[PDB]
Structure 1
Amino acid sequence: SASIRDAGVADLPGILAIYNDAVGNTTAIWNETPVDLANRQAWFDTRARQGYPILVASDAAGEVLGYASYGDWRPFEGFRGTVEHSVYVRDDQRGKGLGVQLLQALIERARAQGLHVMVAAIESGNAASIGLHRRLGFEISGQMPQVGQKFGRWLDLTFMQLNLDPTRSAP
């Protein structure tokens, strides 16, 4: 039912609500402090400057059911072919394949932009997220113990990556 489209500034309150819910309730984002609309507007502006997409999964009423974006992975010019993405689905919208729809769409954008590699950073216990990525062609590249903390406990990080143009032998 839901459609995937580019985000506008009017989607930012719905984006913020999803972001802050993950902050409060999950390991999907390793921050414990919630942010305000201005912070997400600054994030939106950053993506605009970079020319990177922000996509939303939306319903008829314009409710944000999920969103996805990518940014730079490491801050050096040698990494310009590589981006790190994030995909968030509203908690009540889980189990409907929206994460797949969002990530499929984001991959197609990344390809159209001539990018080389998409990197996912996933908390290692999040089997749902790992499986979603695996089924879209991502491979495990790293497993990094105790690099994070949240809820008073150490967290491990799994890196997965997708090469978007495996035939491109040279940059």
Structure 2
Amino acid sequence: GIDIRVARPEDAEEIQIIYAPIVLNTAISFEEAVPSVEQMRERISTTLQTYPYLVAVREGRVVGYAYASQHRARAAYRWAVDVTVYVAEGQRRSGIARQLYDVLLPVLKRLGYRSAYAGIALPNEGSVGLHERLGFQHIGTFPQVGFKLDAWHDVGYWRFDFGDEGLHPEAPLGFLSQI
């Protein structure tokens, strides 16, 4: 099945349902307090002001989502972008994150980004495997950088290189809008 489409604020509810147990009971995310539905709604809208936000859907329900965000604040970094992907429990390994990425990555390239970074709390062999298969390269690991759920956690970064690190790059454009 599976169709990828642009996310909407109305997807907040299913997205929150996917994301809340990840915040609650895993070190996948370094957030501590479960974000409300209303919060995820605002995160969707704000992200869309500049970046793609995507959902994967199967028979009308959201089974995963993906979005991009700013890699770092300072001007010279503006060709670097962060990517985030999540899949509902029980729908993993069925290729959903892969499909999300196969849409998100080309979108980012055409916007003007030169590289995308995925932050992965380690260990997570299934997430590493997926990024290795997609062609990301592991460029570094911040060891025991986070504390959550009674343990210290490594965070590795995986880089997808869009190429075209040419000599006169132009600033990336808005997904659908702003400058």
TM-score bracket for this pair, using the shorter chain length: over 0.9
Residue among 63, 66, 75 paired with 1:65: 63
Paired position in structure 2 for 1:52: 51
Q: Which residue of 2 aligns with 1:153?
A: 151
Alignment partners' CA distance in 1, 2:118 and 2:55: 18
TM norm structure 2 = 0.90
Tell me what 1:169 maps to.
Answer: 166
SS in 1 for 2:40: helix
Higher relative CO (Cα under 8 Å, sequence separation at least 6) belongs to: 2
Q: Secondary structure at the match of 1:69?
A: strand
Within-5 A mapping of 1:1-171: 1-49=1-49, 51-60=50-59, 62-165=60-163, 167-170=164-167, 171=169
Kindly indicate whether the alpha-carbon contact (under 8 Å) linking 2:12 and 2:38 is maintained by their aligned counterparts in 1: no
- Which 10-residue stretch deviates more, 38-47 or 104-113? 38-47
Q: CA RMSD in A?
A: 1.1
Instruction: Report the Cα distance in structure 2 between the residues aligned to 1:41 and 1:91, rounded to whole angstroms.
Output: 21
Distance in 1 (alpha carbons) for counterparts of 2:128 and 2:119: 10
Q: How many residue pairs were aligned?
A: 168
Partner SS, residue 24 of structure 1: helix
Q: Which amino acid aligns with 1:168?
A: E
Deviations along 1:37-86, whole A, 9 cap, x unmatched? 2211221122122x2011001022x2110000010011111111011110
User: Shift of residue 90 of structure 1?
Assistant: 0.1
Residue pair 2:9, 2:45 contacting (<8 A) in 1 also:
no
Distance in 1 (CA, whole Å) between partners of 2:93 and 2:161 is 27
Moved over 6 A (4+): none
The normalised TM-score by structure 1 is: 0.94
For residues 103-124 of structure 1, give each alpha carbon's deviation from its aligned partner in whole angstroms, at most 9, with x where no partner exists.
1111011112111100010012
Structure 1 residue 91 displacement after superposition: 0.6
Distance 1:144 1:48 in 2: 29
Instruction: Give 1:160 shift.
Output: 1.0
How far apart are the structure 1 equivalents of 2:9 and 2:117? Answer: 26
